[PDB]
Amino acid sequence: AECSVDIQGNDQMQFNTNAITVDKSCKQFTINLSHPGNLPKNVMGHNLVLSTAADMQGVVTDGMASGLDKDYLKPDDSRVIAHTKLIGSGEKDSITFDVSKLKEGEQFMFFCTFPGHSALMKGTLTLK
Numbered sequence: 186a187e188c189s190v191d192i193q194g195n196d197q198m199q200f201n202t203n204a205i206t207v208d209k210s211c212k213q214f215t216i217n218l219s220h221p222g223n224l225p226k227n228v229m230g231h232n233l234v235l236s237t238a239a240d241m242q243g244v245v246t247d248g249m250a251s252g253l254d255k256d257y258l259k260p261d262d263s264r265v266i267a268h269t270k271l272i273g274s275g276e277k278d279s280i281t282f283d284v285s286k287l288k289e290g291e292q293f294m295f296f297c298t299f300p301g302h303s304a305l306m307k308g309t310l311t312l313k
C-alpha cells in the first residue's frame with residue numbers, strides 16, 4: 186500500500202482533509218505538509234501533530250504556552266507521537282515516522298497547536 190499523504194493548511198485555519206488513514210502494512214508513513222496561504226507563521230503558522238484522542242488538548246494547551254520559538258510545542262512532550270515543524274505561507278515540511286508507533290483500534294488525532302487553530306484544524310488518524 187501507499188504510505189504517504191500530502192496535506193495543506195491554509196489562511197482560514199483549515200486542513201484539506203478531515204481524516205487520515207494509514208495502511209496497517211506500512212512500516213513508515215510520511216506526511217507532506219504545505220502552506221498555500223499568504224499569511225506569516227506568526228499569525229497563521231501551522232504544524233501537523235499526532236497524538237491519541239485523549240492527549241490532544243493537553244498537547245495543544247501546553248503548546249500554546251510555549252511560544253513561536255518552540256513551534257508551539259512544550260519541550261520533551263512525550264504525548265506527541267510525531268509531528269511536522271510549524272510553517273508559514275509558502276513553506277513546506279515533511280515527516281516520516283515509524284508506523285509501529287500506531288496501533289489498530291486506537292483513536293488518534295492530527296491537529297495544529299498554533300494558538301486557537303485546533304478548534305478547526307484537526308481530524309482523525311486511523312491505522313486500518
Ligand SMILES: [Cu+2]
Pocket residue numbers: 194198229230231232297298299302306
Ligand atoms: Cu495552524
